[PDB]
């Protein structure tokens, strides 16, 4: 989501970072994703930091002697050291050499510290006389070739959680939907981490995730998919920026001008209020249908409509006309043209007469395709077919 | 039958090393070559070649022990050479396209590279990437000049 900035609990220019007490776990992260539990306590060494392989061959820039925490140039390289420097030969060549921040410092009759070193020493403790100043790390072990304490200056850290958030309301719709703030700090590693020459600025970070709570559906779905949007709303009398966490489901329909003939036509309405837990549980769409022509609707499937396929009739669509025979004739019978069907006369039809019945007949249309035993057919009675579509082949 | 692939496959399946752990060899490499030039001494000078034993090297050694220091000391280079590998391909392949073939091309890579891989010296610590890079390059363009031409040119 959102990342905040502080130079606070930041280090100098890289360190161990001797400290004392915060609490965060492993946490599987006690790396990045952190919630920095607790802390007045965090406490650096910021150290440089340079490490490099090469031979055993170039400055006897050295620890036991400090070297110049000042700007030599060791092993044909450099720093802005501040402080007293250590090798590692212990590969007949080396891998790494550090700049150890700080005065060095200067000692001799070496139990004393050595026997009273091991521990990070304290302002005001003295040194063996000699007072101090921060919580000192001391060399836990007193420089080598005899003479020195060490004391890389020691800076030591807070926090609890999370400064203040200012006129501010995470929310969603928020009935289940937890859709809210927070702040996720943050602080890359621990009291037995020495970090490497610039700053690890991060050790407390908040960069900020907004989750997306509960598992409910009807409103807030998307469990790992319900995901956050920002627009710029609240930009005007308070233009500073709010910043929604808003998330979804926008869907669509389709034309509601699509009106044809065949196809069941399209009229239509929304429900909306902008501004709703979707207007309560909510029925959005219409798409209301035109008919090719206005008459009784039959082959119809109660329900919706998966099927292409209701009458709309008239005396035509489902024939009908004149029969100067008399009042005469039965129901329902599928004519083809000129069986006894005036009876004693003979017209058109192929299909349902229904009736006959001042002469009014009721003579409809349904074509004969007498096929043969064999086919490899295609489809049904009442299905109302489909201008052209194909209805059965025969092998 | 890629080729390139069928070969750079291989490859891949030999791994990558660091400059510590081509700094072992770079001595060993050194121990055999200077090793030779022994043998080229004693060439010279004499019956034209060492080149019979522990006196194949006028040098001291007890003999099994010889044959086997050349065998580290070359070994490395050989280790290195192929440790490389890649990154020379790197480089071949952008004359693969140049002309010569990408295979044309990589073999005359790795000639350099050899030569490279020995006249090359970890007392300078920088790592070959700013070295043996160079002496590829060289090689290379002396192939598409020297011929991918059907009628040799003065490549000056």
Same mark, same amino acid.
């Given at each position: 989501v959102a990342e905040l900035i502080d130079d606070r609990y930041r280090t100098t220019t890289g360190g161990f970072l001797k400290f004392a007490g915060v609490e965060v776990q492993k946490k599987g992260k006690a790396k990045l994703g952190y919630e920095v539990v607790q802390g007045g306590t965090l406490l650096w060494i910021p150290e440089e930091t340079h490490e490099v392989n090469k031979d055993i061959s170039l400055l006897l820039v050295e620890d036991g002697q400090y070297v110049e925490a000042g700007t030599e140039v060791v092993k044909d390289i450099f720093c802005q050291n501040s402080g007293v420097v250590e090798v590692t030969q212990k590969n007949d060549i080396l891998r790494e050499v550090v700049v150890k921040p700080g005065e060095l410092l200067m000692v001799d009759d070496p139990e004393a510290v050595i026997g009273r070193d091991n521990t990070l020493l304290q302002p005001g403790e003295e040194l063996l006389g000699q007072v101090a100043t921060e919580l000192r790390y001391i060399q836990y072990v007193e420089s080598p070739e005899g003479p020195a304490l060490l004391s890389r200056p020691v800076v030591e850290f807070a926090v609890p959680s999370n400064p203040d958030v200012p006129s501010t309301t995470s929310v969603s719709q928020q009935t289940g939907r937890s859709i809210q703030m927070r702040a996720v700090q943050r602080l890359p590693y621990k009291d037995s981490e020495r970090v490497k020459s610039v700053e690890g600025v991060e050790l407390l970070r908040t960069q900020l995730v907004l989750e997306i709570e509960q598992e409910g559906e009807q409103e807030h779905n998307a469990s790992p998919l319900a995901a956050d949007i920002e627009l710029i709303p609240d930009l005007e009398d308070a233009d500073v920026q709010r910043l929604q966490l808003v998330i979804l489901e926008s869907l669509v329909l389709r034309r509601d001008i699509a009106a044809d003939a065949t196809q069941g036509s399209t009229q239509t309405s929304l429900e909306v209020k $902008?501004? $709703?837990?979707?207007?309560?549980g909510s029925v959005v769409a219409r798409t209301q249908i035109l008919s090719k022509e206005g008459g009784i609707v039959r082959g119809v499937q109660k329900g919706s409509e998966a099927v292409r396929r209701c009458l709309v009739l008239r005396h035509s669509d489902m024939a009908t006309l004149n029969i100067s025979a008399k009042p005469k004739v039965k129901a329902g019978d599928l004519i083809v043209a000129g069986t006894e069907l005036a009876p004693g006369i003979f017209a058109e039809e192929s299909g349902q007469i229904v009736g006959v019945k001042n002469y009014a007949v009721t003579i409809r249309a349904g074509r004969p395709y007498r096929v043969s035993p064999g086919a490899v057919l295609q489809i049904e009675d009442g299905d109302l077919v489909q201008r052209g579509d194909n209805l059965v082949l025969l092998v | 039958e890629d080729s390139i692939r069928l070969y750079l496959q291989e490859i891949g399946r030999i791994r990558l090393l660091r400059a510590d752990e081509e700094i072992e060899l770079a001595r060993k490499i050194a121990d055999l070559l200077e090793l030779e030039r022994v043998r080229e001494r004693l060439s010279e000078k004499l019956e034209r070649d060492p080149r019979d034993s522990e006196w194949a090297e006028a040098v001291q050694l007890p003999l099994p022990a010889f044959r086997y220091r050349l065998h580290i000391g070359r070994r490395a280079k050989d280790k290195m050479v192929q440790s490389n590998l890649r990154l020379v391909v790197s480089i071949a392949k952008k004359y693969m396209n140049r002309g010569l073939s990408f295979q044309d091309l990589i073999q005359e890579g790795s000639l350099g590279l050899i030569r490279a891989a020995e006249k090359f010296d970890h007392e300078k610590g920088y790592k070959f990437s700013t070295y043996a890079t160079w002496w590829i390059r060289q090689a290379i363009t002396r192939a598409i000049a020297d011929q991918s031409r059907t009628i040799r040119l003065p490549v000056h």
């Open positions: $902008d501004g $709703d837990t979707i207007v309560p | -």
